[PDB]
Amino acid sequence: GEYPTVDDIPVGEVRLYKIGDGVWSHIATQKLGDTVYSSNGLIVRDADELLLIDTAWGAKNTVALLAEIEKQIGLPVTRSISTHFHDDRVGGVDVLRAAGVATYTSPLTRQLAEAAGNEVPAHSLKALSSSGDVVRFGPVEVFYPGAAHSGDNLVVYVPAVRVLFGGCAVHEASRESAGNVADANLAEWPATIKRIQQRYPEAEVVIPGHGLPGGLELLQHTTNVVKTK
């Protein structure tokens, strides 16, 4: 049906949304002040297991995520990748570890998470240290396009179905400001977007870290938003 939003996900709950064959997004919320915010991750089937991209933004939500996955898909999450060091990506890693998931991210993300006092995935993805680096991981590619929203942000591509999870380096269409730039590299963000555009020219779906999925237009949209400043 319609992509889940803060206006229709019951409080405390996590939703899944089917994106294509063997690929779902997960959507969770975290109210701060008067505004309820949502956050997206990904789930990708591989053989008879699941690969998780990002936590559901905190321990409580991540427990609910695992329960929703069991209810709706019924296959075990065996590995996860966090796409940068913020709480919407690693908050809940200890829940994943308790559930027997092998948790991964880049070495830089582990370092930044440790410095921030955030939860830290247990394992490093090697050969992701330089912009342009890419590695295969089961049914996905993991690409480090360079600094943008954060110094460490990764994107994840599902080649079989042309789905790009852009994460927080990519803004949703309705967003016209960059939001939280405390860890951002605004100078490098446009070049980082260009690397993503050049690497994944056939992507059919682009999923931002927050908000509605779109297509490749979200990439240039993000650059446009960055240019404001």
Which residues form the catalytic set?
84, 86, 88, 149, 180
Asked if 152 touches Zn ion (CB under 5 A), the answer is no
β strands within 118-226, DSSP E: 123-124, 133-137, 140-144, 155-158, 163-167, 205-208
Shortest spacing between CB 48 and Zn ion, in angstroms: 31
Residue 22 or 90: the one with the smaller Cβ distance to Zn ion is 90
User: 210 labelled as ligand-binding?
Assistant: yes
CA 10 to chain centre: 22
Site string for Zn ion, 154-193 (x = CB under 5 A): --------------x-------------------------
One residue of 146, 209, 211, 213 binding Zn ion per CB under 5 A: 209
Residue 50 or 178: the one with the smaller Cβ distance to Zn ion is 178
**What's the CA gap between 92 and 55, in Å, rounded?**
6
Q: Are the C-beta atoms of residues 131 and 195 closer than 8 Å to each other?
A: yes
Shortest spacing between CB 149 and Zn ion, in angstroms: 5
Q: Are the C-beta atoms of residues 70 and 52 closer than 8 Å to each other?
A: no
Q: Are the C-beta atoms of residues 217 and 196 closer than 8 Å to each other?
A: no
Interaction site with Zn ion (CB under 5 A): 86, 88, 168, 209
